[PDB]
Amino acid sequence: LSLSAGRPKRPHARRALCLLLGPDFFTDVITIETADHARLQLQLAYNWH
Amino acid sequence: VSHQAGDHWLIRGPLEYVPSAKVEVVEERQAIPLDENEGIYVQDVKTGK
Amino acid sequence: VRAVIGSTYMLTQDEVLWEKELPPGVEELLNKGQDPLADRGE
Amino acid sequence: LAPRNKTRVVSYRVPHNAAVQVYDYREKRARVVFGPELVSLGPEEQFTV
C-alpha cells in the first residue's frame, strides 16, 4: 500500500505492507478563504477507524 | 530393494554404511532444523512442483 | 510452436526452444513494473 | 551495556498500575497482563511497543 503522509499530506510518501484499521487520526493543513476574501489556513485532526 | 543403473536414493538414519562396488556416493546431507511456523521452499526437480 | 506448462519437460526429438520476442516497451513494463499500484507513484 | 543472553527466557516486570500486551504468534493467543506481575516471553511471543 502506497499511502499519503506529511504536513500538507503529499501523496506517495509512505509505502506500507499492512493496513492499520484501528482508531487513529491524521492531521492536515487546509488553506481556505472566507466570503470577505480573507485567506486563513487551518490545522485539523480527523479521528478515524 | 532394486535400483536401476541411474537411480539416485538417499541413505539416512543411525547406521554404518560401507559403499558398494556398484554404488557411488554423490553428496552428504544434513537435516535442516526448523521450528514450528518456519519452513523452506523445496523443488521436486523430478516433477518441478 | 507451442507452450508446455506444468511438470518438468525433456525436449523430445525434432524439438527446439523457441524465442518469443516482445514489442518494444513491453519488456520495460514487464520488468520495471512489478506492481502498478506502486509503479505509478514514485 | 552488557549484551543479553539470547538463549535466556526474556522477562519483564510490569509495575504497579500498569499492563502489557503480548501475542503468541505460534499458538495464536493474545493476553493482557495486569498489575505488578512478571511477564516472560515465550519462544514466539512479542511485546506490544
Ligand SMILES: NC(=O)c1ccc[n+]([C@@H]2O[C@H](COP(=O)([O-])OP(=O)(O)OC[C@H]3O[C@@H](n4cnc5c(N)ncnc54)[C@H](O)[C@@H]3O)[C@@H](O)[C@H]2O)c1
Ligand atoms: N487515538 C489516537 O489519538 C491515536 C491512535 C493511533 C495513532 N495515533 C498517532 O497520531 C499521529 C498523527 O500524526 P500525523 O497524522 O500528523 O502523522 P502523519 O500525517 O505522518 O500520519 C499519517 C497517518 O496515516 C496512518 N497510517 C500510518 N501507517 C499506516 C498503515 N500501515 N496502515 C494504515 N494507516 C496508517 C496514521 O494513523 C497517521 O494518522 C500518528 O502518527 C499516530 O501514531 C493516535
